[PDB]
Design a protein around this ligand. Structure first.
Ligand SMILES: [Mg+2]
Lengths: 126, 46, 91, 473, 145, 42, 792, 184
RNA sequence: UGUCAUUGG
DNA sequence: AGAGTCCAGCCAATGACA
DNA sequence: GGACTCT
């Protein structure tokens, strides 16, 4: 049913490629809430301030503060992506929304085929 | 009659001075008798 | 007995601690001062945090206690100690 | 600590505490002799200047991750300012003085207590205006903010850049000071008890006729001043050089720190026992400075007269400036566009003997700490170096030096060829660019040589006298 | 142990013994510092100049044997040389303060301490050697109960 | 070679500056500063 | 003897860790008759010839006698008088058969005096090895000839070989001499000048390549690397220069020994005493990179170590790489870094000596009451620890680690051998399936009694199988009481006496099995202090490795199990409330990737973002321009970064309202734009948000170690392997792993999670293998002590 | 009980099925080569069908949470409900949630064990006799609340000795015995 | 009879 | 979550000091 | 300085 919205947003020439990439990279990179308590070494201090800020539980709210300042008004798949989608299709819609923004920007939507800067042309002497 | 070191007796008397009573028990072993045993050959059989 | 506190000779601590016990053993005397004398004769670290006081617990205090120093190890007669060297006439 | 012409000396150990949870409790805090104030408000009291000034001063040459903490502590200071209706800084300071005055249950009036509290603040800055005390607190806050983020680019506490060393006479001076104060205090206690027991202004001769100093000078040689004096072991003739040249660091630590490298022997360290990594040995070119009190006062007066006579309109840069301090006492605040014009000229006048001394340490701390430090006291490790002035070796521009060297001594070289050899201390050595060899200097381009301030002597001068007994280590 | 400077010290000591004086005739030492920056070939050239001042003509095998301090040594029993040349030369050698009779201890019988009635401690007092706890572990591990 | 001779000039005694024994001169000056001037000040 | 010194033999010196540089030794005389008999029998050095764990001889030859042994084996074309001069007082019963010219192999054949065989060493008494090296004559080596001679007859024969060998080697040194001169090391300046020019060419090539990379970053043509990867690249270039120096030193050693074949330095290098290409690289080549705590020396004040380098100097020579050698002489900075390593090693061994002593005393007092009882079992108190001591009920000095021969279908009885291998094949694949066992435990050294024989005189094949099977069944009944699995003994006797590779006579097999029954009957006895012997061997080994600095610290990307004494002490401490290294092995990488994404710590600040904010009416707007190569180097996506920032801003207290948008700036940039209004006071909360934003916007468990997915080749058996993916996580509990699809995944936790899930036997097994792994490579003989500790 | 920790329980219930058809079998992961599972997952009851491969015998286990237990016997049932408890409890059909955080039967740390019959128990008890009078050695101990004792359970055969087949780097397999002691 | 200092394997 | 408590290799040798 | 236990 999302092909209606995705043909509203972009052509049907790089469409199911976008769909399969968003599906497998959303089911691959799905992130839960993992740990980070102070009952369990040191990074750079500019990041360590925020890290030991985020270690404690009193700096976090008990329930999620929903966003208020309205963004993404050209692409209003967010209107369902707020709370109609919460399982795998939420991150699937997020990934295809990023792909739609990249392909309307006219640039590569993947990150695997953004190929590495090979640095062993500077460090291959002797 | 006991045959212990002098430092053992000094240690036991000082532990008695701390209040720990140390009481030793002795073996009144039953008198044992040697009886003859059968022949045992541990060499293998080929 | 006196065998745990012999006459020290060079030119006892427990005898002095018992004397400080018996210096408070009177009918017109509190149980707190007798209790403090008994405690610092037996174990000073119950009421204090100082070492080097020769009390009863000195025979069971740490590495230099009585068993580790004088029972499983001792200084012996018929002993010797010397520098070593090699020998070719010695197998 | 007070300057050495102020007897008896005053020690004041201050502490600044910072928490990201409580940025309003940025508390300067001593023990039983000072109040617990916000340091931004204390600098506002001493310097009499706005908080936007302190924000612009702490954010001038800082990386942008430090400016966030600067803005946070300035906003917490403004919040604790606005929390009281019509805030006055003198009223808040005096209220804290009143509160700890009645808290300490001291039997003293409030003018004496307030003068004793606010005049004995910073004994090393005892007779300076209070605005320089406030700007000293601001530069200390700046060093704290930099050390919070870049803690490895700050001098470690086990470093030799941070410490001074006691010689033979300093033990005797410390013990004489302690026993003189004990003698006068015993006389005072005896006089007070004579007035409060019998009622006549008298003193017993049994208290007065003993100074308490004979027994102290006898027990000074027992070494118990942790491990100063000891029984001389008569192992070798070399030990009479080995022991009075060895420096003990008595309690990270005991590992070989880079600050111990040039000024101490690398190989003459103990390898076992309780003092392993604790006792170092001076190099053959390393000395420890001694100075008299008369020379100290003349030297400090001449350096302040040089700072105020020249650069007369350019030493008032308290916002966006380099604080020129002499023995941690903040004296001036130079223009940031003049610092390399200052320090070099200062070195040009140190080797010329313009100040009456040749071992005046002049450290230029760049790298967003931004301070000029002048050290004149005793107990510093100094060493001769070869001067590189503007990209050329000054040893290589004196042609008569090779023909006149054998018929002249070291002081004759320092007087007649003054810009050839500089006496550099370990703090000035740590914060400068030194070249390792003259061969390594001469194999460089003529533009790489402009970066280097000094040049080193050969490596045989980096060993002790015990290590010079060995060959080819 | 990679003590390379000992060989250079023997080479320079032997080169001093060839020529102990300078060109003025005065006793000059050989500057070989604790942290040395002159190469080994400069010391070989100095030793060559010393040995060529001593004997004004040598075969170059003899000169290379004198510089490197190699010598053919002879077995004193059979009066025949060994297989290869031996590093042979003079060096400054040091005696250390650890003598054998300062450490030599023996006790048959002697005093006993008053409390525990075991042997006394010191070496001036003629005490015993402490049969410690690890020696007790060793005699337990031998099976000698 | 010139810096080595300049460094050797520090090690030799300096009779003009009052340095008769450089390996222990700072300790002599330390004790002299105590017993000649600073004890009089204290 | 003469003098005031206690004169010991040098042959016992390595047994006591003794030098003659001022060491003292003590004596005690215990003249009690029971003690006299026990001293005469049990503590005599002939009784203590073999080591009680790994069986190698405790006595042997030292430094000069090694090279004397080598040169005595290599000598040729001697007269009878020269041979008798070398032999000395042992030339009395020397038999010249019909020869007039002799060699050193004839001297060795006379010295051994037995016609025994051994694979790789002996054949009919002659040494069939190429050279005699330090593995042949030095104490505590696995190829000792005295060990083979005492495996053949008795400890008296091994002690006689040691005495006679030391006499003959010292007579060789008296006749021929041995000395190393300076001319053997550095005969001229040619090779050292060549290596100096090579090093000063290659290190300037390294510096110019690194400067080209730095200038390409500085002008902006490439994005910069992380500091860890940059340090790894420079580390690889300097390691390549070090290996080039090593190869040059090895080629010089080869060319010198083919030019001057009588070089004494290369003679003691070939004999196996203390000279290798690395020490000759330290003398003649380069000194290498000086490591402190596994890395170079850390940067102090002004981004440097010494003031001899510029502030924030990228010079690798100023971080501790030494270009000079001991022949050239180290410069001042190089001497600083060498002295830093030396004084660090001295401080570390002084700090570790007392800790090793405390742990040694604790383990000795725990294990000292564990003995072998009258039935061959290992007990302590009234608890049975092991059913059979040393898995054989034979002494550990008699037991021989023999080669494990995997089943081949060319063998005679491949079916029975493969059936036994299917029975015992577990445990031969270990170390998280990374290692396959190459050695097993023969009950005694039966290889010295094996003589080859032509197939007409050999024992019949079925009769040899009947003999092996009947002996192993009788032993399993009568000696192990039908409660111990000794199929490894039958496997050893079936593969090593296999007629497909060796034929033996009937009397050879009778000799072997009679010796087997003799070792089962006479060697091990009740009351053997196996616990204190194992504890002393473990304690002596970790003390030696701590005082010798044998375990070098090295840093890597993943979290690894540590090696050495502090890891051994952490293992025996068994502390509860600490994190454990939990290893996840899987055939498919998707199941490891799903846990690696969720557990690996990535923050916004380590992604190197470009964060800039500006105030606007109704909103403070923060633009976060991140680079996409930084997102790919973190192995995450842009949606992961968006989720990190969104989770932090949506759950924070100081933010009152917010709204997020994602812009595309390039294929090199992604702009996360946040619109914000903070909780009043909004300026202080603004500054606190801008301070904590690069760190608090994160994901995963906070740890200093990353989680890289490794891979290796794991064993299912000897003949079948598979590629396996590995992953290690520092983790306290096992609870948060319970939300993932961890099916068909091997999980190796620490000791307390293994106890709480799998039980006490798996905890015992983990403790065994983990305590063994702390000693390093080459210490498999410490398996039997460590098990004895773990079972305690 | 979730959709992931029921497959690990299915691997455990293959070993429980093997013990239910032969109490003196050797339990390791190789037993999993002789069985086949089918899982019907639901948040009230999960049905796990274990099938023997060659004999085609089926056994249906009904897996419940500790709170909601609705057990009526289905055909081919095990005879007792399998309960996933929150903590380690006493009972052969009560598996705690920590046992099923990972896949435990396929692990290298999963042991190989047997229950001894009366002949092997008599041999072990006569080996443990010290010969002197009525004195006896003791086996090392193991708690009854362990997954080995839960797998090895038989209703009228009391489990006192468990024989373990340890991995051994030098000998292959080693035999040990633990004695099962009581809890609560 | 114990502390402190220095040193050795 | 934070203080109390106990633990820190073995065997030496000199001298000074209470 | 660091690990175990009671609070
Ligand atoms: Mg030695």
């Amino acid at each position: 049913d999302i092909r209606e919205l995705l043909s509203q947003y972009v052509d049907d020439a790089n469409l199911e490629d976008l769909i399969e990439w968003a599906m497998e990279k959303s089911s691959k990179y799905y992130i839960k809430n993992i740990g980070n308590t102070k009952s369990n070494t040191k990074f750079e201090s500019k990041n360590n301030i925020g890290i030991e800020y985020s270690k404690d539980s009193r700096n976090k709210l008990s329930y999620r503060n929903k966003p208020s300042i309205a963004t993404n008004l050209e692409y209003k798949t967010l209107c369902d992506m707020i709370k109609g989608t919460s399982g795998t299709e939420k991150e699937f819609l997020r990934y295809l929304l990023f792909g739609i923004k990249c392909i309307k920007k006219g640039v590569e939507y993947n990150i695997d085929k953004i190929k590495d800067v090979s640095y062993n042309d500077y460090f291959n002497v002797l | 009659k006991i045959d212990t070191t002098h430092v053992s007796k000094v240690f036991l008397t000082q532990m008695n001075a701390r209040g720990v009573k140390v009481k030793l028990d002795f073996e009144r072993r039953p008198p044992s008798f040697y009886k003859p045993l059968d022949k045992v050959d541990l060499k293998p059989s080929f | 007995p006196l065998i745990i506190r012999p006459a020290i000779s060079f030119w006892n601590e427990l005898t002095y601690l018992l004397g400080m016990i018996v210096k408070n053993c009177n009918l017109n005397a509190d149980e707190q001062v007798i209790q403090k004398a008994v405690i610092e004769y037996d174990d000073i670290k119950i009421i204090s945090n100082n070492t080097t006081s020769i009390n009863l617990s000195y025979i069971t205090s740490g590495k230099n206690n009585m068993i580790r120093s004088y029972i499983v190890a001792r200084r012996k007669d018929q002993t010797a100690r010397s520098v070593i060297g090699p020998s070719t006439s010695i197998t | 600590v007070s300057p050495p012409n102020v007897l008896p000396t005053r020690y004041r150990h201050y502490k600044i505490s910072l928490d990201i949870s409580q940025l309003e409790a940025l508390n300067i805090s001593s023990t039983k002799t000072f109040i617990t104030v916000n340091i931004v408000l204390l600098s506002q009291y001493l310097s009499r200047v706005s908080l936007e000034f302190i924000r612009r001063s702490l954010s001038y040459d800082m990386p942008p991750e430090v400016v966030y903490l600067v803005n946070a502590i300035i906003d917490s200071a403004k919040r604790i300012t606005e929390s009281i209706t019509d805030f006055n800084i003198d009223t808040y300071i005096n209220d804290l003085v009143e509160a700890e005055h009645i808290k300490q249950k001291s039997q003293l009036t409030i003018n004496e207590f307030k003068y004793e509290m606010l005049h004995n603040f910073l004994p090393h800055m005892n007779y300076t205006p209070d605005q320089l005390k406030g700007f000293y607190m601001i530069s200390l806050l700046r060093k704290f903010l930099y050390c919070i983020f870049h803690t490895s680019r700050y001098p470690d506490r086990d470093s030799m850049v941070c410490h001074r060393i006691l010689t033979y006479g300093k033990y005797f001076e410390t013990l004489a000071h302690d026993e003189l104060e004990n003698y006068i205090g015993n006389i005072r206690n005896d006089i007070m008890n004579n007035h409060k027991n019998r009622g006549t202004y008298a003193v017993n001769i049994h208290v007065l006729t003993t100074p308490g100093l004979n027994h102290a000078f006898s027990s000074l040689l027992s070494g118990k001043s942790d491990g100063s004096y000891r029984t001389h072991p008569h192992y070798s003739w070399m030990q009479n050089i080995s022991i009075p040249r060895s420096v003990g660091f008595y309690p990270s630590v005991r590992k070989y720190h880079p600050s111990q490298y040039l000024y101490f022997c690398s190989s003459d360290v103990p390898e076992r026992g309780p003092q392993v990594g604790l006792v170092s040995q001076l190099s053959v070119l390393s000395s420890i400075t001694n100075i008299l009190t008369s020379e100290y006062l003349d030297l400090e007066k001449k350096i302040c007269e040089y700072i105020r006579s020249y650069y007369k309109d350019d030493i008032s840069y308290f916002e966006t400036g380099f604080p020129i301090t002499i023995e941690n006492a903040l004296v001036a605040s130079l223009n940031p566009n003049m610092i390399c014009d200052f320090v070099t000229d200062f070195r040009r006048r140190k080797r010329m003997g313009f100040f009456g001394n040749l071992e005046v340490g002049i450290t230029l701390v760049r790298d967003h700490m931004n301070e000029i430090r002048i050290n004149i006291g005793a107990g510093r490790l100094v060493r001769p170096f070869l001067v590189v002035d503007n990209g050329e070796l000054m040893m290589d521009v004196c042609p008569e030096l090779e023909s006149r060297l054998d018929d002249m001594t070291f002081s004759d070289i320092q007087k007649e060829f003054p810009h050839v050899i500089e006496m550099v201390d370990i703090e000035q050595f740590t914060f400068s660019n030194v070249c390792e060899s003259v061969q390594k200097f001469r194999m460089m381009s003529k533009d790489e040589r402009k970066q280097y301030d000094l040049c080193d002597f050969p490596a045989e001068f980096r060993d002790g006298y015990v290590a010079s007994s060995l060959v080819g280590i | 142990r990679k003590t390379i400077s000992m060989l250079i010290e023997v080479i320079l000591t032997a080169a001093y013994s060839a020529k102990p004086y300078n060109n003025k005739g005065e006793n000059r030492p050989v500057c070989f510092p604790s942290s040395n920056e002159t190469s080994i070939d400069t010391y070989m050239q100095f030793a060559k100049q010393c040995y060529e001042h001593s004997n004004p003509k040598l075969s170059d095998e003899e000169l290379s044997d004198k510089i490197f301090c190699e010598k053919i040594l002879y077995d004193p029993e059979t009066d025949k040389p060994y297989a290869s040349k031996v590093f042979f030369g003079p060096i400054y050698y040091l005696r250390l303060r650890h003598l054998t009779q300062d450490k030599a201890t023996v006790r048959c019988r002697g005093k006993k301490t008053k409390l525990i009635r075991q042997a006394n401690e010191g070496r001036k007092r003629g005490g015993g050697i402490k049969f410690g706890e690890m020696e007790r572990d060793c005699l337990i591990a031998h099976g000698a109960a | 070679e010139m810096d080595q001779r300049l460094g050797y000039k520090f090690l030799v005694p300096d009779p003009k500056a009052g340095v008769f024994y450089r390996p222990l001169h700072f300790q002599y000056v330390s004790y002299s500063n105590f017993i000649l001037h600073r004890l009089h000040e204290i | 003897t003469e003098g005031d010194t206690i004169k010991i033999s040098p042959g016992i010196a390595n047994s006591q860790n003794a030098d003659f540089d001022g060491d003292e030794e003590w004596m005690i005389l215990e003249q009690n008759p029971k003690a006299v008999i026990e001293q005469s029998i049990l503590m005599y050095p002939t009784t203590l010839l073999k080591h009680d764990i790994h069986g190698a001889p405790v006595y042997g030859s030292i430094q000069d006698e090694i090279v004397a042994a080598y040169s005595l084996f290599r000598i040729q074309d001697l007269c009878l008088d020269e041979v008798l001069n070398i032999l000395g007082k042992y030339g009395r019963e020397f038999d010249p058969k019909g020869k007039c010219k002799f060699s050193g192999k004839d001297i060795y054949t006379y010295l051994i005096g037995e016609k025994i065989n051994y694979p790789g060493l002996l054949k009919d008494g002659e040494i069939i090895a190429n050279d005699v090296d330090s593995n042949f004559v030095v104490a505590m080596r696995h190829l000792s000839l005295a060990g083979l001679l005492s495996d053949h007859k008795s400890n008296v024969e091994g002690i006689n070989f040691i005495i006679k060998s030391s006499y003959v080697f010292k007579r060789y040194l008296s006749i021929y001499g041995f000395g190393v001169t300076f001319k053997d090391l550095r005969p001229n300046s040619t090779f050292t000048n060549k290596l100096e020019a090579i090093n000063v060419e290659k290190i300037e090539l390294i510096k110019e390549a690194y400067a080209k990379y730095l200038n390409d970053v500085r002008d902006g043509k490439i994005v910069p690397l992380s500091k860890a990867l940059e340090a790894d690249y420079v580390e690889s270039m300097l390691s390549n220069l070090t290996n080039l120096n090593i190869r040059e030193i090895e080629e010089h050693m080869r060319q010198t020994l083919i030019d001057d074949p009588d070089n004494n330095l290369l003679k003691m290098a070939k004999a196996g005493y203390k000279v290798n290409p690395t020490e000759l690289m330290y003398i003649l080549g380069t000194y290498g990179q000086q490591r402190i705590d596994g890395e170079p020396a850390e940067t102090r004040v002004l981004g440097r170590v010494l003031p001899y380098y510029l502030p924030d100097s990228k010079d690798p020579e100023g971080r501790g790489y030494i270009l000079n050698s001991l022949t050239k002489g180290l410069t001042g900075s190089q001497y600083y870094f060498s002295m830093l390593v030396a004084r660090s090693q001295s401080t570390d061994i002084v700090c570790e000596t007392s800790r090793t002593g405390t742990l040694a005393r604790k383990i000795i007092k725990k294990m000292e009451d564990m003995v072998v009882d009258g039935y061959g079992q290992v007990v302590i108190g009234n608890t049975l620890i092991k059913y059979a001591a040393n898995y054989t009920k034979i002494l550990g000095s008699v037991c021989k680690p023999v080669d494990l021969i995997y089943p081949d279908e060319s063998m005679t009885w491949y079916l029975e051998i493969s059936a036994l291998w299917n029975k015992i094949k577990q445990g031969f694949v270990y170390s998280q399936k990374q290692k396959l066992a190459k050695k097993t435990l023969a009950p005694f050294n039966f290889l010295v009694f094996v003589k080859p024989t032509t197939e007409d005189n050999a024992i019949k094949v079925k009769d040899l199988y009947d003999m092996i099977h009947n002996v192993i069944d009788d032993v399993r009944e009568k000696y192990f009481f039908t409660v111990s699995n000794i199929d490894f003994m039958e496997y050893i006797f079936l593969t090593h006496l296999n007629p497909s590779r060796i034929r033996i006579t009937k009397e050879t097999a009778i000799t072997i099995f009679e010796k087997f029954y003799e070792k089962l009957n006479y060697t091990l006895g009740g009351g053997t202090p196996i616990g204190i012997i194992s504890a002393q061997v473990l304690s002596e080994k970790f003390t030696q490795q701590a005082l010798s600095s044998f375990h070098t610290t090295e840093k890597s990307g993943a979290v690894k199990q540590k090696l050495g004494f502090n890891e051994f002490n952490n293992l025996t401490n068994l502390s509860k409330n600490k994190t454990e290294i939990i290893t996840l092995v899987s055939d498919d990488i998707s199941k490891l990737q799903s846990v690696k994404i969720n557990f690996e710590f990535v923050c916004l600040g380590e992604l190197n973002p470009n964060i800039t904010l500006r105030k606007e009416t109704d909103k403070y707007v923060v633009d976060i321009i991140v680079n996409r190569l930084y997102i790919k180097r973190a192995e995450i996506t842009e949606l992961v970064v968006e989720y990190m920032i969104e989770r932090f801003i949506s759950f924070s207290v100081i933010v009152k309202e917010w709204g997020m948008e994602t812009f595309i700036e390039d294929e090199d940039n992604i702009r996360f734009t946040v619109y914000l209004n903070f909780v009043e006071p909004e300026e202080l909360n603004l500054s606190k948000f801008m301070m904590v934003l690069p760190g608090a916007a994160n994901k995963g468990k906070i740890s200093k170690f990353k989680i890289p997915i490794s891979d290796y080749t794991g064993y299912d058996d000897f003949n079948q392997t598979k590629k396996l993916n590995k992953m290690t996580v520092e983790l306290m509990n096992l609870k948060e792993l319970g939300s993932f699809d961890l099916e068909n995944v091997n999980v190796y936790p620490g000791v307390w999670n293994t106890y709480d899930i799998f039980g006490i036997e798996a905890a015992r097994e983990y403790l065994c293998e983990a305590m063994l792994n702390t000693y390093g490579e080459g210490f498999d003989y410490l398996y039997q002590p460590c098990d004895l500790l773990a079972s305690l | 009980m979730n959709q992931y920790n029921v497959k690990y329980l299915a691997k455990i219930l293959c070993l429980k099925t093997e013990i239910a058809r032969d109490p003196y079998a050797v339990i390791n992961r190789n037993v999993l080569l002789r069985y086949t599972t089918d899982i019907e997952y639901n948040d009230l009851v999960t049905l796990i069908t274990v099938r023997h491969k060659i004999d085609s015998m089926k056994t249906v286990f009904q897996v419940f949470n500790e709170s909601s237990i609705n057990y009526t016997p289905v055909d081919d049932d095990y005879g007792e409900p399998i309960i996933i408890t929150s903590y380690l409890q006493k009972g052969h059909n009560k598996f705690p949630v920590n046992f099923l955080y990972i896949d435990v039967v396929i692990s290298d740390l999963f042991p190989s064990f047997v229950r001894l019959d009366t002949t092997e128990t008599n041999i072990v008890n006569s080996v443990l006799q010290t010969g002197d009078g009525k004195k006896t050695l003791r086996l090392p101990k193991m708690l009854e609340t362990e997954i080995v004792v839960k797998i090895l359970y038989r209703p009228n055969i009391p489990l006192k000795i468990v024989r373990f087949f340890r991995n051994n780097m030098v000998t292959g397999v080693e035999i040990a015995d633990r004695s099962v002691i009581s809890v609560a």
